[PDB]
Design a protein around this ligand. Sequence first.
Ligand SMILES: CCN1CCN(Cc2ccc(C(=O)Nc3ccc(C)c(Oc4ccc5c(c4)CC(=O)N5)c3)cc2C(F)(F)F)CC1
Length: 295
Amino acid sequence: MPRVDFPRSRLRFKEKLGEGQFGEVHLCEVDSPQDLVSLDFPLNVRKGHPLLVAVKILRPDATKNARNDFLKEVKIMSRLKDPNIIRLLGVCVQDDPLCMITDYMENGDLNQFLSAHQLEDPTISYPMLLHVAAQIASGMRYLATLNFVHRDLATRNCLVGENFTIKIADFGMSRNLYAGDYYRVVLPIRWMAWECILMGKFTTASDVWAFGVTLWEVLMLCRAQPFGQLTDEQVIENAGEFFRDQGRQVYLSRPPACPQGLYELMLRCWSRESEQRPPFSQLHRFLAEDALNTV
Ligand SMILES: CCN1CCN(Cc2ccc(C(=O)Nc3ccc(C)c(Oc4ccc5c(c4)CC(=O)N5)c3)cc2C(F)(F)F)CC1
């Protein structure tokens, strides 16, 4: 927990960004940010331009548990300091409503971003795609080594900042745009490891499985839903065939842009045994070095 609250009096309401069970997210502008610039709130001020922030707000009528989940997320957010994780700029916890304030990424989520691009045969290059994926891996390595499990890694939960900087995020909002990505059994089954689906065992190993699917989205430039050839029920049945491991299961196909070695890395992310899936340190090293060095 930060010593001091960010001052609510400085948040100028622009727009409601969304909503979930917890409450809501607003886009705010920081009023006269140059006066707030300190060691405790190091803000990137640009004279003549609004400093925009996202603010996640706990509903006033929230339950004891919801309030506790929210404060747990505050404590977690306060720790995460890494170039590829969304950054906590401040909090408002003295009074209700409880708030978390983050940087605002104007390029939106990675899925929106890549969906608007096409591959360099607005364009994006294969090296840049590897750089995107390397940043996600690096963010996930940081998370894993702080003993955190994400549980919902996907391009929809990555944000694009400036100069192709990617930040892993976790919104907790219900966004109609991605409703088809979740299945009520409410779970992101197409990104989930077989053991998650069949048992509910969530681990860094299942985050690696999700990273694999996320790597596939990126290399597909987010043009198809993973396993779009399978209905939701059939995705569940497919998990059963991974457990079966008699080779009957459906694997995501090699994207056109993906060379064989990168595809086989993805395949290892989908190894039936968790311990054979590569750690994020290895995934990052392979994307930042081996894959980049063999363009
Ligand atoms: C087992 C469950 N895991 C535990 C570890 N958690 C880590 C975590 C938690 C919260 C967020 C998180 O992200 N929280 C958050 C905080 C504040 C706000 C305002 C918020 O959401 C925003 C909504 C819209 C926009 C932004 C933030 C920035 C923007 O440009 N738009 C989310 C991000 C992570 C991450 F990245 F490490 F994985 C993930 C769940």
